Design a protein around this ligand. Structure first.
Ligand SMILES: CCCCCCCCCCOc1cccc(COc2ccc([N+](=O)[O-])cc2C(=O)O)c1
Ligand SMILES: CCCCCCCCCCOc1cccc(COc2ccc([N+](=O)[O-])cc2C(=O)O)c1
Lengths: 356, 351
């Protein structure tokens, strides 16, 4: 916890030390270390660190045993690797969804010294640094290969979830005619596709976009390192928590205080959100047409229309009801684990998800 | 053969995605999109890098069964998939217009930058899934994936340097400035061969020559000192290859398949050579006219390259560098690899 955060500099500098070993002119070496030290600091720090903490807690409580400082070094490494993964995903996402603020400060890709060209390159750098760190600290552990496979697999699922989140209402999904490889015009205005507006599609997307890397990955890391039918049960719980987490994120996107969430766009970006689905199943026929006419447009007035509907239909109150039922369903599954230590960590995680 | 196996590796990967827990209609959308991502971006190149793996593997040792060819062709196609990820990324970063004689992936209305960014990570990560599928039981498995990782890290740093060598941060990053854009200008302190070699070795040499050669050797069962010699040769080849690329950028997209170094404010060999040859007044002209999206400005640079006989200086560099590379190749003391590298040297610009 306090320990996990004191260790950040070590992992950052181990990776920067690897870059420093390249055959480059000294002046070039100093520019590189200065740029990359900021890349990490700006993007890795400031989060709730829920995912990193989950690794440290699971590694410890999987089994009450003596754990020495050499072993902790390896666990804190994996913990920071997941925070670095979060960093890469968030820089990418802000490029993709045209973010403005993240963790209460300008998105990385907006800085004029960075711009989109550097941010894209930086995403791949952060992403690859994970595997370099894992090699530096865990290369001789027997779980080595499984740990990197787990990071790889979760990332692949996250990428598919992000593809779906980005394209679920797009022409190529609506008119499922092939992609015109000769068309480089602006696409026409994005619009919602009512046939995709259901919870089954939504779960598909969010489980892949969120559940695998935010819950399954950290728990599986903690367990693999600690040293089997159970991984299946933990996977089911992760799916439930990822959906719970993402729906709360959707709620914050439109009902949250940007000064508290640290970020400013779902409606503008034409996303399939929980508030959208909930409204669509409850609202009148004229209001469905109003949603189709107004959703996914940049115009602030179009957005207010959607926002007013969410108020008209008391979506804030529907969320509260969903939150209570989902938490119960999650605790329910956690109790069917039959593993005291892991159950204990997951219950604490559940209490602390939204604050950290 | 290598040509013929493409569909299998592609389909092996798409098949992994197809095993996901997703509704059937969703699976078919995903299948359709990603089949095009691979097809559109992996095919149409000269395949120099993939072919190098195949040749090295074959000449390193023996009779080769199809089981073995399956592993070697996997690595070859993984390097072409890496090339695909890099080209999509590079075209986003440098605002490319054409690549391999067709529109850049990121420019398509159905894709755009937001998808292109996600697709770069998809292609890059599919490499490690493919290597798992075909090589997870080989003793060289861990070394192979570390070679891909490390070559990629060097390429990212090289691409970082190519992108920023002339920027004002290379002459503290302002984390409060999202409003005042920086105008592209050249920095004369960076216009030299030393700096250029740093950039070019990291940006090209490692993934284009070292990585493919090391894959073949590793898979073939070669720690050994030859790896160091291979690294040195690769650096010379990467430099030879990039300089040739720079030359073609000024001196027919029909043949290159792509359009812009001057207007893009790129550090190039022609820029450096002209700069070491020209008078003071022409240095001022270059500074005033380079890196500008402007027909008149670009023609001034074009004329200076003609004036200072850059074509002739290139012909001359080409001759000297090929000699240095062949001289390095002969110090290998491994007939098979020496042959492949000679063969590569003849085929570089044609494929
Ligand atoms: C590479 C291509 C692969 C896909 C590219 C992006 C993938 C999108 C999935 C991750 O997107 C992100 C990113 C960040 C946050 C969140 C969620 O809420 C948070 C959770 C934790 C932290 N943290 O405690 O700060 C903050 C937030 C926050 O509300 O900011 C979701
Ligand atoms: C952020 C990701 C990490 C780094 C960011 C991108 C890295 C950029 C480095 C590679 O950029 C590229 C890309 C592609 C090609 C070339 C070179 O010439 C080629 C060589 C071989 C084939 N091939 O036969 O097509 C074609 C070409 C071609 O002239 O098209 C250079």
């Amino acid at each position: 916890l306090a320990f996990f955060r004191n260790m950040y500099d070590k992992y950052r500098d181990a990776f920067l030390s690897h870059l420093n070993e390249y055959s480059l002119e000294e002046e070039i070496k100093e520019h590189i270390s200065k740029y990359y030290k900021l890349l990490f600091d700006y993007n890795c720090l400031g989060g709730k660190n829920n995912r990193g903490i989950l690794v440290i807690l699971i590694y410890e409580y999987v089994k009450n045993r003596d754990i020495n400082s050499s072993e902790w070094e390896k666990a804190a490494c994996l913990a920071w690797c997941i925070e670095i993964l979060q960093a890469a995903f968030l820089v990418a996402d802000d490029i993709m969804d045209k973010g403005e603020m993240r963790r209460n400060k300008y998105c990385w890709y907006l800085l004029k010294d960075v711009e989109t060209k550097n941010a894209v390159n930086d995403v791949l750098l952060l992403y690859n640094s994970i595997y370099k760190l894992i090699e530096i600290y865990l290369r001789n552990e027997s779980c080595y290969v499984d740990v990197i496979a787990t990071f790889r697999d979760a990332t692949l699922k996250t990428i598919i979830g992000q593809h779906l989140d980005t394209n679920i209402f797009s022409d190529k999904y609506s008119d499922a005619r092939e992609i015109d490889v000769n068309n480089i015009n602006v696409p026409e205005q994005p619009v919602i596709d009512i046939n995709m507006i259901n919870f089954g599609v939504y779960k598909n997307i969010v489980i892949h976009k969120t559940a695998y890397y935010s819950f399954f990955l950290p728990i599986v890391c903690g367990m693999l390192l600690a040293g089997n039918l159970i991984y299946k049960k933990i996977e089911d719980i992760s799916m439930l928590m990822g959906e719970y987490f993402q729906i709360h994120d959707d709620y914050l996107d439109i009902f949250g205080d940007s000064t508290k969430t640290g970020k400013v766009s779902d409606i503008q970006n034409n996303k399939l959100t929980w508030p959208l689905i909930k409204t669509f199943e409850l609202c009148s026929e004229p209001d469905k047409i109003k949603i189709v006419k107004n959703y996914g447009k940049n115009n602030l007035a179009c957005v207010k229309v959607i926002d007013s509907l969410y108020e008209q239909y008391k979506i804030r109150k529907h969320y509260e009801s969903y939150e209570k039922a989902q938490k119960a369903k999650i605790l329910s599954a956690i109790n069917e684990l039959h593993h005291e230590g892991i159950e204990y960590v997951l219950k604490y995680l559940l209490e602390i998800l939204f604050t950290g």
